[PDB]
Amino acid sequence: KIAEIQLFQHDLPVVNGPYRIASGDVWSLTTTIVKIIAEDGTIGWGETCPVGPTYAEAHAGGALAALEVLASGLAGAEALPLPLHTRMDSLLCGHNYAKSALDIAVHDLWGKRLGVPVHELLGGALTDSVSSYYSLGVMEPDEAARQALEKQREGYSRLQVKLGARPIEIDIEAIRKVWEAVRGTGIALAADGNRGWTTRDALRFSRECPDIPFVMEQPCNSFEDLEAIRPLCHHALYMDEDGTSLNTVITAAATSLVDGFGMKVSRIGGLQHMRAFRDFCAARNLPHTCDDAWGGDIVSAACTHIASTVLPRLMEGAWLAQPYVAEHYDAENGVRIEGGRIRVPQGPGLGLTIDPERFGPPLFSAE
Amino acid sequence: KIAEIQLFQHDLPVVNGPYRIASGDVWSLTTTIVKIIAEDGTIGWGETCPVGPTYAEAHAGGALAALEVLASGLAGAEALPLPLHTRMDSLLCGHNYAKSALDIAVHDLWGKRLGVPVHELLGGALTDSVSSYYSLGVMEPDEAARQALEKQREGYSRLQVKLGARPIEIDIEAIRKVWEAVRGTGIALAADGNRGWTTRDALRFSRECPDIPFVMEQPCNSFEDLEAIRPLCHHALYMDEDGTSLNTVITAAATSLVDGFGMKVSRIGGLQHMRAFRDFCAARNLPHTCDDAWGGDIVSAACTHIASTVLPRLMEGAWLAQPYVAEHYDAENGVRIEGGRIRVPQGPGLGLTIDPERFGPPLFSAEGHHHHHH
Amino acid sequence: KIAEIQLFQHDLPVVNGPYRIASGDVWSLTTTIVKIIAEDGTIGWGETCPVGPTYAEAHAGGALAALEVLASGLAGAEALPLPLHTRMDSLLCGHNYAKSALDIAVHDLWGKRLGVPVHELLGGALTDSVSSYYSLGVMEPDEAARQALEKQREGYSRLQVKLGARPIEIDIEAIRKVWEAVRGTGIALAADGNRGWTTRDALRFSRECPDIPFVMEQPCNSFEDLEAIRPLCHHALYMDEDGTSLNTVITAAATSLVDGFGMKVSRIGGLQHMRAFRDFCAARNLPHTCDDAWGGDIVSAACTHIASTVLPRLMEGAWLAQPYVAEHYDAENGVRIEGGRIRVPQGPGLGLTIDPERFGPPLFSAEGHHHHHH
Amino acid sequence: KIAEIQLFQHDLPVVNGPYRIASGDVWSLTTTIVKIIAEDGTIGWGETCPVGPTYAEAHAGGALAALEVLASGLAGAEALPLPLHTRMDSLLCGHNYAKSALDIAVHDLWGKRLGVPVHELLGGALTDSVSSYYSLGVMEPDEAARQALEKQREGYSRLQVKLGARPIEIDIEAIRKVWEAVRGTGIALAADGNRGWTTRDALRFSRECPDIPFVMEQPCNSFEDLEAIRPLCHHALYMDEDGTSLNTVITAAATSLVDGFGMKVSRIGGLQHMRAFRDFCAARNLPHTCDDAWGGDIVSAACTHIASTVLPRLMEGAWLAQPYVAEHYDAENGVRIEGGRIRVPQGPGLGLTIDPERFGPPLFSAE
Amino acid sequence: KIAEIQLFQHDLPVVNGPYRIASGDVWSLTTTIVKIIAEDGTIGWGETCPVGPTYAEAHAGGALAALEVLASGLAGAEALPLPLHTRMDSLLCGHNYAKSALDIAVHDLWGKRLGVPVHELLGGALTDSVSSYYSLGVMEPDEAARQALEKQREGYSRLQVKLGARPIEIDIEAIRKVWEAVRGTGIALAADGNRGWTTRDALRFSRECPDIPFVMEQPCNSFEDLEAIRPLCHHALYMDEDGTSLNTVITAAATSLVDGFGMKVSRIGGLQHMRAFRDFCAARNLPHTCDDAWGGDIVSAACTHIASTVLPRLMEGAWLAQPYVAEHYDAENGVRIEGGRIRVPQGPGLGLTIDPERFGPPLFSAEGHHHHHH
Ligand SMILES: [Mg+2]
Ligand SMILES: [Mg+2]
Ligand SMILES: [Mg+2]
Ligand SMILES: [Mg+2]
Ligand SMILES: [Mg+2]
Ligand SMILES: [Mg+2]
Ligand SMILES: [Mg+2]
Ligand SMILES: [Mg+2]
Ligand SMILES: [Mg+2]
Ligand SMILES: [Mg+2]
């Protein structure tokens, strides 16, 4: 049973920032960290870190406020996923990104109690290393082409080119220059509009580039706009920002609106829901990423554990903010991308050993 | 231009509570108040008050947290609706219920500057008084039928019966008993499932009651569930909780998914978006309410002003929390439901005079590029 | 790691048989049992038992033949769900009902290794006891109404009336008589057509009985037939036999073809897929059962463990063959329906202790890269 | 009336194997042979041979087990197609591939009794020779191009290129190299994904190759995925693996989901159902093949007889495993591909004379 | 090989006529008979007989004209179904009702050559006797109810009530009176609108009679009209006149437009196409009849042979003109309805022996590449 919950926040400056996105650039991020303490004194860590306040319907102050409400009613709840989510949903409607942090912490605590990695609790890892993909922030076409080649040479299996908040002509220039730089290396390519394109411009982006094998990731602002362009674009379409619940995913998958997903653990509400999402995609043969918005070692561990349980043929990559984060929470064991790939942790829980005072005194504590 | 913004919270205990909802009951509510101060010293007031944390994706602590972000980036902005919303959207994605409070305050400030009521700024009132509807919490069928007749007798033109969080047969019993009590009085009837029914049970509710003239208000948990039952229910269907943006409303109206709406000002993001919603419903001949989740005189004034601008034949009623709120913010001018109807305010702005210290010291304030946690 | 796999078959005569189904009656059943032995000597048990050879695309000889293929390729594999299913799918396409038995055994082994009940591995039980439903075989209308009241009186929360293989007017007579016997008791009612009705007759069944609150469970023979009647029937529609994979379930739920499911663990391919199914139904607010075709304590334990993890408002009941099965495999711990409900096991794994020789010598065994026909 | 049923199995090593398919490669196949004996002592032969256990929901041990159940309840049934299927369906739900073998045997027995070829019983042959198509197993792009030209020169009217279980880039390379080798010869081309492609990759396959006139055969894993790509691919789409019943075919044909079919006799449940399938396709002007999964002379004869009754303009070819099978069951008369074409048998029944002991003693016999 | 083809016409006055149809009444009918003679002297007989010139796109003079074209191009062709239809389609587009007669004759010849009944060539009879249905012409409601009971008492398993060419209220009166007379007897009921109803009136017919278990057979004039009413009628809908080819049937079955068919052998183009139709309906679990427009023993034998091959639960009945036909072509073996059922013939071919001069001298004959108008 959960005995105590502590909340903290921590600044994560963007190494070589800003990191530039159609829906809003970021210079520094404020992560929200949860520590759950069981009646036996063992602890589990969780984390949620929105990519600033305009990427999605989520912000650092919102995480903390929601987590205060959740934490205030969670003492005595069983530290297992279904009992946890049952209690959380009785306390607060929605706020998946906040609930995610407590879900992560429960999986950490559960794995530590049973002496198994989180990937075991999620059904069993299929691999001991996972692929990643690199995200090029919005930048000059020439710089994107340069960095694309560089990251291919580092060993990334896939590259995501962020686009938008500028004329579509320049986005098309950027994707052509990137493709010219990396064609024949076999690296996979995603064009991410981050909700930034009118249907007018998304139609043009696809029409002009039949022989560039990108997938279009969330080109347009709404689910309905994805529906508008779907029958008129011969390139694959992925959902990202619109995938705000398992219910909405089921609507998209069942109607074959999309060919795949960028999926964030916090958006969907934690590992409990991410594992259902994984199983949905496996049933439907839909590729997907295993990401979160941002974060340090705790988020990185959560993504890596779930990524390890995905059929490699469907796993498009686990993106991590790690390259943009200066300091590990666990200096020796924190997950890191090496050669464009990530080693799966094999110790109990998330595989982290973080000093209970790593983040200073709690901002809030319940029980 | 906005010179300063102050945020407050205030407790509103429910008069004769609790107020019982299928998605979660409420005993007492924390409202979040905004005061905007113009460079010239004039003030405008706004308010947002979720009905606890489980009724919608909204809570009092979330209102405050979002308003801190918004307030921190608003000094210097023009107190006009479109400039305001452009700025707010650049500072924070979504959180309509928080943005609503600043929108209301801006409309108050703007009306006071020009010397006209908010209803004028919204295009002009079509009436000096508006209809309301009474919402029966979930309660025993027999208690429901009694209270239904009582409220019809008070003069309410419409009754909403809250249902759910119990077997469907009890909901059907309750709607039948209510109908038996009020049939022949001409009172309009809504059956509010509060997102609480499976499609199984929504189908049964309609199927068993062809001769009871309810509309089914948000019977099921999702937009997709509304789509499922729509072709299979011969009773009118209204959207409420799922109407989370103008975009989503346009998707529903354009596809004729629904025959009307329960609409809350906070959910849609303030009066600027409510006025667009009104115009969309007028174009589509779709009836709607003009409500909010909860609140005192500031929210009630906002709802009444927009309600006054709706063609009465399409205005299903402005529901107010006022009967459940113990104290007015403005004892002279605060809106009250009288005989099931509401008199439209005629002063400048929202038509309220509220002491600048009515809610105590601020919790938070922003002036220029600085902010202060008090 | 899996060291050895043994296969057995065992006869289960129907207590007071036959058990009468529209797609084919059953007098006695041959169950197929799997025992997995870990390198450390711990054992896990699984089971699959078709209701004869005509109820589904499944039969006892087919279970054994498929398990021989699967078992022959499984030594050395990790006894974890995802590794197991990846391996099984590489050895044999489809045959979910066979794969289910190995899935169950793996969950038993895994729970025993970690010292926790299967319901914990499935995310955590939400309850210490689960509801059940009673299934009335096809029988005279008058016998049906009598037995319906009898089973309501025992405490069952739900009754399934099997129908078909006779004129539709007799099915309608039977559902009306049953309803007249139990109406007012609050017991839920399902009308199971067992794939046996033409669309002609399904339309009539619903059309004639608007005030009888049944759900129609798999009235017709195909997915396409469900699609045909869906827009024309105002009663809820549930899928059963057509739910042959998670993919197909997603097609049905996503298009709102159905309002719920009868689901069998063997049909969907084991607990790993049942847990996904549960999560899909939770996301879509779709009620479902947690059943299997037939079986003894191993199947019954599997169903009860998954059932314990479902929100009670969406769990239509865990049907067990247990009342029709003469003998327990584990006399101490084998699950029994008591007062129409089932106590959730709390021991490690499935919560069973079954003698390694309970089913006699193996018919087949695999260890490493060798197999043996006994 | 049927007096006795005997079951046998027989090994068929793949000549120059393995034979390589996206859904699973095969090195040797185990066929299941049925002999029905009438009350007058005359016999009919049937056969079913899954292409290993992961191609479809079918396997050699499953055939035998199902056939045991069927055989155990078939004594006394009339040896005519509708009475047979009526009895079989009363004994066992589904298992079309098993039922197929008994159906074939009944057509053989029926033709022998009446002294007419099976093609007469199926409505009358329209031709005395039929076209075939050759199936290139998954192989290197260069090797495929080489073998494609070779098989065109042998006289095949159509070539099927098996693809998948590798990056789509290589599949596209393979089809372009094949097309470069055979363009202008007029040979028809099919690209068979064998369920191996995500919708992402099937969209790309078509988009990149508008001027290569392939049909895409079962590119994706499910019926729903075929539905997803149909409005977004300007190449013709054929169903193969998803055509598991006449009911499902009717859904696909009636909704114009597909432009044609790869159809296997065993999948659809025998010649009785294949002849209905033929008539459906004729009504809808949909081309189709006349195939089975694998097998020796008995299967080959069944395919050839039904193929002979198809309007040549709609008959895409009868594929036979015969080139991969070392030994005929009937050395003198077993059907064989010659010059890419197959001579239609003209004797009674299937046109086979097989020693009653050709396969050794029965594994099982009923009555 | 076909050596010679002879064509005849013969008058069939309606016994106790006229026979009244919404699309046009009939007093007497001209049948068109084909005799095919094989190179070896064996003969096969076929027949086609429209119900006058306004019931369908077909008439006796058109049958003869089309048969002259077909016959002129058929000498030397193999008397097997697929070779025949390939040849016929190369000579003349459409005219199924004419082609049917040659198809029937070929099946007769083929059966006689092999020494087996036509039902064997069609895959094997599943029964030694088949059900029939009686068709009540349009008549006063009271006369309809009387005759309905009379025919139920004779043993008919199903009754078709012809309707239309009068106000819909009279049709509704008639179906209600009929139902009141036969309800409780278990007799199946079809309401045949004969293409005669506007969608307005079809909607009313169904709407007013939810508790009368008719199927609506071809209520409206077009395929599009069936599509219009389908989503708005809770009674089963059957296609008849619109089922003009296998292609069109596949369009209807595949889209679940209908729940069954009235099917005529001549309309679909003969037994080869009827057998395909049967197999399509079996795959889709769609009930159907096995009828033809009119005719004597040759048509009746054809219908009975195909009917014998249909699963009895899907065979709604083989309607025959036989009760309205004064004279048999074969007095010994001609099929007769007895107790509402028909005994399946068991001789070779159609099971008929008809004198080669039964219909007088030929009107037309073809041998080799020559033809003769007599
Ligand atoms: Mg993205
Ligand atoms: Mg005025
Ligand atoms: Mg509401
Ligand atoms: Mg417990
Ligand atoms: Mg209706
Ligand atoms: Mg069932
Ligand atoms: Mg195009
Ligand atoms: Mg293929
Ligand atoms: Mg016979
Ligand atoms: Mg008719």
Q: Is D352 helix (H, G, I), strand (E, B) or coil?
A: coil
Q: CA dihedral in degrees (A338, A340, A344, A349; nearest 10)?
A: 80
What's the rounded Cα separation, in Å, for the pair B307 and B127? 9
**Domains along chain B?**
1-115+350-363 (3.30.390.10), 116-349 (3.20.20.120)
Residues 6+ apart with CB under 8 A from A14: A26, A27, A28, A29, A324
Contact C198 E287 (CB under 8 A): yes
Question: Judged by CB atoms within 8 Å, which residues 113-142 of D form the interface with E?
Answer: 114, 116, 120, 123-126
Contact A93 B224 (CB under 8 A): no
Distances in whole angstroms, Cα of residue C98 to Cα of each of A90, C51, C271, D62, D70: 39, 14, 13, 11, 20
Tell whether D314 is within 8 A of chain E (Cβ): no
Which of chain C's residues have a Cβ under 8 Å away from the Cβ of A112?
none
Query: If we measure between CA atoms, which residue out of E153, E205, E135, E152 comes closest to residue E175?
Result: E205
What's the rounded Cα separation, in Å, for the pair D191 and B11? 70
Is there contact between A and E if contact means ≥3 C-beta pairs under 8 Å?
A: no
C99 counts as catalytic:
no
Is there contact between B and C if contact means ≥3 C-beta pairs under 8 Å?
A: yes
Contact E256 C225 (CB under 8 A): yes
Strand partners for C159: C134, C189
Residue of C212, C235, C237, C285 best to disrupt the B interface, most CBs of B under 10 A: C285
For residue C255, the chain D residue with the least C-alpha distance is D224
Residue D106's CB is within 10 A of a number of other CB atoms, namely: 31
Whether E80 and D124 have beta carbons less than 8 Å apart is answered as: yes
Q: Tokens 């939400």, residue?
A: C126
Instruction: Provide the b/e sequence for C88-125 (b: ≥16 CB within 10 Å).
Output: beebbbbbbbbbbbbbbbbbbbbbbbbebbbbbbbbbb
3-state SS record for C231-265: HHCCCCEEECCCCCCHHHHHHHHHCCCCCEECCEH
Q: State the maximum Cα–Cα separation within chain B, in Å, rounded to a whole number.
A: 62
Q: CA dihedral in degrees (D79, D83, D88, D91; nearest 10)?
A: -120
Question: Judged by CB atoms within 8 Å, which residues 240-259 of A form the interface with D?
Answer: 256, 259
Whole-number Å distance, alpha carbon C141 to ligand 6 midpoint, is 19
N residues, chain E: 374
What's the rounded Cα separation, in Å, for the pair E290 and E303? 6
Tokens of E118: 């036509």
C1 counts as catalytic:
no
Q: Tokens 């629904």, residue?
A: B258
Residues 6+ apart with CB under 8 A from E48: E31, E32, E63, E97, E98, E100, E101, E266, E292, E293, E295, E299
Query: If we measure between CA atoms, which residue out of E76, E88, E63 comes closest to residue E1?
Result: E76
Tell whether D273 is within 8 A of chain E (Cβ): yes
N residues, chain B: 374
DSSP state at residue A320: -
What's the rounded Cα separation, in Å, for the pair D95 and C53? 10
Rounded to a whole number, what is the distance in Å from the CA of D251 to chain E's nearest CA?
5
Is there contact between A and D if contact means ≥3 C-beta pairs under 8 Å?
A: yes
Whole-number Å distance, alpha carbon E96 to ligand 10 midpoint, is 18
Tokens of D25: 């490669």
What's the rounded Cα separation, in Å, for the pair B272 and B96? 12
Tell whether C204 is within 8 A of chain E (Cβ): yes
What's the rounded Cα separation, in Å, for the pair A6 and A36? 7
Residue D243: burial class (beta carbons within 10 Å; 0-12, 13-18, 19+): buried
Whether C236 and C260 have beta carbons less than 8 Å apart is answered as: yes
Instruction: Provide the b/e sequence for C45-81 (b: ≥16 CB within 10 Å).
Output: bbbbbbbbbbbbbbbbbbbbbbbbbbbbbbbebbbbb
Residue D134 counted as an annotated binding residue: no
Distances in whole angstroms, Cα of residue D40 to Cα of each of B166, B293, D4, D36, D79: 71, 86, 11, 11, 12
Tell whether D111 is within 8 A of chain E (Cβ): no
Residue A189: phi and psi, rounded to 5, are -130, 130
Whole-number Å distance, alpha carbon B124 to ligand 2 midpoint, is 8
What's the rounded Cα separation, in Å, for the pair A320 and A301? 10
Tell whether A70 is within 8 A of chain B (Cβ): no
What's the rounded Cα separation, in Å, for the pair A98 and A75? 17
C207: nearest CB among E210, E215, E285:
E210
Question: Judging by DSSP bridges, how do beta strands E43-48 and E28-38 pair with one another?
Answer: antiparallel
Whether D71 and D5 have beta carbons less than 8 Å apart is answered as: yes
Whether B190 and B157 have beta carbons less than 8 Å apart is answered as: no
- Where helices occur in C186-236 by DSSP H, the ranges are 199-207, 223-229
Contact C285 B227 (CB under 8 A): no
Instruction: Provide the b/e sequence for D181-206 (b: ≥16 CB within 10 Å).
Output: bbeeeebbbbbbbbbbbbbbbbbbbb
Q: State the maximum Cα–Cα separation within chain E, in Å, rounded to a whole number.
A: 62
Ligand approaching nearest to the C-alpha of E125: 9
Report which residue type is found at E83: P
Tell whether E94 is within 8 A of chain D (Cβ): no
Q: Is C117 helix (H, G, I), strand (E, B) or coil?
A: strand
Q: Tokens 């007492």, residue?
A: B28
What's the rounded Cα separation, in Å, for the pair B136 and B149? 11
Residues 6+ apart with CB under 8 A from A331: none
Report which residue type is found at A243: G
D54: nearest CB among C23, C53, C93:
C93
Coarse DSSP helix, strand, coil percentages of chain E, rounded to the nearest 5 percent:
35, 20, 40
Residue E265: phi and psi, rounded to 5, are -60, -40
Residue A169 counted as an annotated binding residue: no
Tell whether C167 is within 8 A of chain E (Cβ): yes
Rounded to a whole number, what is the distance in Å from the CA of B55 to chain C's nearest CA?
17
Whether D328 and D301 have beta carbons less than 8 Å apart is answered as: no
D53: nearest CB among C53, C54, C91:
C91
Residues 6+ apart with CB under 8 A from B167: C186
Give the environment of ion ligand 1: residues with CB less than 5 A: A 192, 217, 240, 262
DSSP state at residue D173: H
Question: Judging by DSSP bridges, how do beta strands B337-338 and B341-343 pair with one another?
Answer: antiparallel
For every residue of C33-47, DSSP letters joined together read EEEEEETTS-EEEEE
Contacts 24+ apart (CB under 8 A), B239-242: B240/B192, B240/B264, B241/B56, B241/B194, B241/B195, B242/B218
For residue D136, the surrounding DSSP H or E stretch is: strand D133-136
| Segments of D205-349 assigned E as strands | 214-217, 237-239, 260-261, 288-289, 315-317, 337-338, 341-343
In chain A, the N- to C-terminal Cα span, in Å, equals: 12
Tokens of C51: 């209701």
Tokens of E206: 């169904």
Is it true that the peptide bond before A18 is cis, omega within 30 degrees of 0? yes
Distances in whole angstroms, Cα of residue C79 to Cα of each of C37, C75, C271, E215: 10, 10, 13, 56
Ligand approaching nearest to the C-alpha of E127: 9
What's the rounded Cα separation, in Å, for the pair E124 and E138? 37
B169: nearest CB among C186, C235, C314:
C186
Task: Please give the resolution of this entry in Å, rounded to 1 decimal.
Answer: 1.7
Tokens of C213: 């609150």
Question: Judging by DSSP bridges, how do beta strands D315-317 and D288-289 pair with one another?
Answer: parallel
Write down the catalytic residue from A35, A99, A162, A177: A162
CB pairs under 8 A between A and D: 47
Which of chain C's residues have a Cβ under 8 Å away from the Cβ of E284?
222, 224
What's the rounded Cα separation, in Å, for the pair D328 and B282? 80
What's the rounded Cα separation, in Å, for the pair E308 and D164? 48
- Where helices occur in chain E by DSSP H, the ranges are 60-72, 81-91, 96-114, 118-121, 141-154, 168-182, 199-207, 223-229, 246-254, 265-268, 271-284, 297-307
